[PDB]
Design a protein around this ligand. Structure first.
Ligand SMILES: [Mg+2]
Lengths: 120, 43, 48, 112
RNA sequence: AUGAUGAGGUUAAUAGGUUCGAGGUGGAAGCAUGGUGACAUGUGGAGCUGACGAAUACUAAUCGAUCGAAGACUUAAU
RNA sequence: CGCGAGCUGGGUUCAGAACGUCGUGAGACAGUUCGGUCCCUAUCCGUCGUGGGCGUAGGAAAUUUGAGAGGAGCUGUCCUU
RNA sequence: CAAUGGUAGGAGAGCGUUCUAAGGGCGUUGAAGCAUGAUCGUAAGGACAUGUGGAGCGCUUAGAAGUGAGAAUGCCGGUGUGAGUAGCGAAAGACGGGUGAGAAUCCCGUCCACCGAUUGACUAAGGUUUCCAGAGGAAGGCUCGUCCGCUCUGGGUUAGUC
RNA sequence: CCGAUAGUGAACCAGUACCGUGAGGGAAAGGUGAAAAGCACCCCGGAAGGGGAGUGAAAUAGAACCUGAAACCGUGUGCUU
RNA sequence: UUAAGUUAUUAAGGGCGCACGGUGGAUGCCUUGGCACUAGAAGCCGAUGAAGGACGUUACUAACGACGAUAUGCUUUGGGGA
């Protein structure tokens, strides 16, 4: 597994942040290496959401951030609720995958490979 | 570390400065030299 | 630790014969006809 | 038969810009533009501006087709460097050259 | 180190994911029972599990580009 | 008395202090004693590893011979005779 | 017919540079400088041609010298080499939206993180407009910059008791 | 007698930028063109720059502006490796 | 066709010559300013407040001159002629 130029605690925090953000937004722009690493994390989250039981929910709460989503009609729910209530339903028949990576060119401030990582 | 020149307005105007220079003959010498040179600042 | 002599112009230009960049790995985009980076999204159109 | 464009005193070191300028010498205008837009060096947008200016000069001043146009020659020579300094250890100051470049691109239809 | 080397690019098991294991840990969570309570027992070798083994195209190797021969003379055997 | 741009810094050879001794003294002794800043981003040859170019008279894939080169090269005890 | 290696060193003859005197000349039909050339003399060095340049300059004889540079760890300037090398100055960021020609770097939001006898709040010295608001991005910010302690324009400090 | 490294330190807002706590120390920096006639308009570009057009005898006289050496940096090639 | 022998071509880059550019500010030409003198004035100024400054003053507004609150100047006499 990659190190991403970061200590173990900082890498863990950054990966769970990136996972939560992809869950909230359904698609994010980031670096290639970080997307290659967050793919596994978010996909294991969707796997836990697909089981749906309480122990699995308690386990997925270990990784997700306490973030709030405002739906339409002023509907409000957490990232955990979105994981177990809308995204698990979207992938009940799919047996892996769950994410796609679209390489984009190098950014300007570095030569960093910017990528879109989305949900599928 | 503590360097030299800890500035202080009172001490600067008391040790140097017009009234201190005018209080001795040698101080008046330095003002005369600076005026002779065309110096814009005397003390 | 420190150079003993100059580096002549000949020696310098010999040393930097391999100091160059390569052309991008680019391909024409099938949808829009403009050049793009292979395995990257066409930035002019946004396809594939 | 020939069109010119010069960008003078570009605040990029000519040794750095000549790397990108080595890629488009003698190439077709379309391929040159694609190379410039896809290479990730600081000098690529600056050279692209000069290329587009030369192409516009061709079209507007001489009425030549910008489909038969090749990058006849492309070079950068030195401009008036700016002299700066960096405070190093023990009170010493080391010089810094911020060099500048005169970038020239001429395009041609390769005829007479 | 980077080049390089080697395994692969859909007519595909290369990596990820998913599923099944090996090894490791040592008995999850939620309930139920017992105890005044700290706790204990049961459900139940349970749960979890980087890198190791297998299967599976679900995701990414989906489009395409570039380089790369036509084989010199002389003599002798043929 | 190989090797400090590879290391150390105990001895030795600055500035401090002290003992014996010498000098009227300032000070001195190859007599002791305690303490006392070891800088340098490697240009060239050289060396250890790794790539590209061209050549090897067509263009390639693989398997090779070995001109040469390097490496290894030590030795104990016990039993039997 | 004879002589002609040469250092310290002696002697002689000359080449150029600036200026002055007198004579004689050349110049916008293009002077001096600069550049190039396959030209001439025994050397110092002298011409010619053609480009550049755009107003001054040779020649003769003779007078004066701030009269000739490759070296002084020379002085002043310019430019290299090392080299696209060392470094980029203690530390945690991620993503979404926004603005722009351009965004890792500016603005907003959420989560995360660091200090908290303090990285918080006053206030002496010291500094002098850096303070605020609009606009800006040449230079300065060790990168970037749409931003700033930078640039521009216009503002801002109220005491009988401090 | 000097003609911008000379001649005053200072031909130019000079005893000034700047240095120092202070006495003190002390620079660097002249030249478009005869006339500003200082490039109206078009085009690329956010701008900077540029290419046309035009002014001018001349615009590689375009404001860093007379001439424009050498070092140094590039781009093409004839002959070579 | 095979054997034996011989010799190209290559230029990643480099070298020399040439051509065209850039940088840079030598050189030439020039003078705003200096340097050394000659002849002739003159050889002090201040409590009637000097020498040097500070701060102001313009229609707008920085800096140099010029001038003080009568302030980018007032009166007078004499030149002076758009
Ligand atoms: Mg210091």
């Amino acid at each position: 597994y990659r190190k991403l130029g970061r200590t173990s605690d900082q890498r863990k925090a950054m990966l769970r942040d990136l996972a939560t953000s992809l869950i909230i937004s359904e698609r994010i722009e980031t670096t290639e290496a970080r997307a290659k690493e967050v793919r596994s994390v978010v996909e294991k989250l969707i796997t836990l959401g697909k089981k749906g039981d309480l122990a699995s929910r308690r386990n997925a709460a270990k990784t997700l951030r306490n973030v709030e989503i405002l739906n339409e009609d002023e509907t409000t729910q957490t990232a955990l609720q979105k994981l177990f209530g809308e995204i698990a339903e979207r992938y009940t028949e799919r047996q892996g995958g769950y994410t796609r990576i679209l390489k984009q060119g190098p950014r300007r401030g570095d030569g960093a490979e910017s990528v879109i990582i989305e949900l599928v | 570390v503590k360097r030299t020149y800890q500035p202080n307005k009172r001490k600067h105007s008391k040790v140097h400065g017009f009234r201190k220079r005018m209080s001795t003959k040698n101080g008046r010498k330095v003002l005369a030299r600076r005026r002779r040179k065309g110096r814009k600042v005397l003390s | 630790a420190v150079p003993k002599r100059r580096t002549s112009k000949t020696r310098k230009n010999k040393r930097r014969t391999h100091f160059k960049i390569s052309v991008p790995g680019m391909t024409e985009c099938p949808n829009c006809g403009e050049y793009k980076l292979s395995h990257r999204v066409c930035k002019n159109c946004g396809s594939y | 038969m020939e069109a010119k464009a010069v960008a003078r005193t570009i605040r990029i070191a000519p040794r750095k810009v000549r790397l990108v300028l080595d890629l488009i010498r003698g190439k077709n205008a379309a391929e040159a533009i694609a190379i410039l837009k896809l290479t990730n060096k600081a000098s690529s947008p600056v050279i692209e501006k000069v290329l587009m200016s030369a192409l516009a000069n061709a079209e507007h001043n001489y009425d030549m087709n910008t489909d038969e146009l090749v990058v006849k020659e492309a070079y950068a020579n030195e401009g008036p460097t700016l002299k700066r300094f960096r405070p190093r250890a023990q009170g010493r100051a080391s010089a810094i050259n911020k060099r500048t470049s005169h970038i020239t691109i001429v395009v041609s239809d390769g005829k007479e």
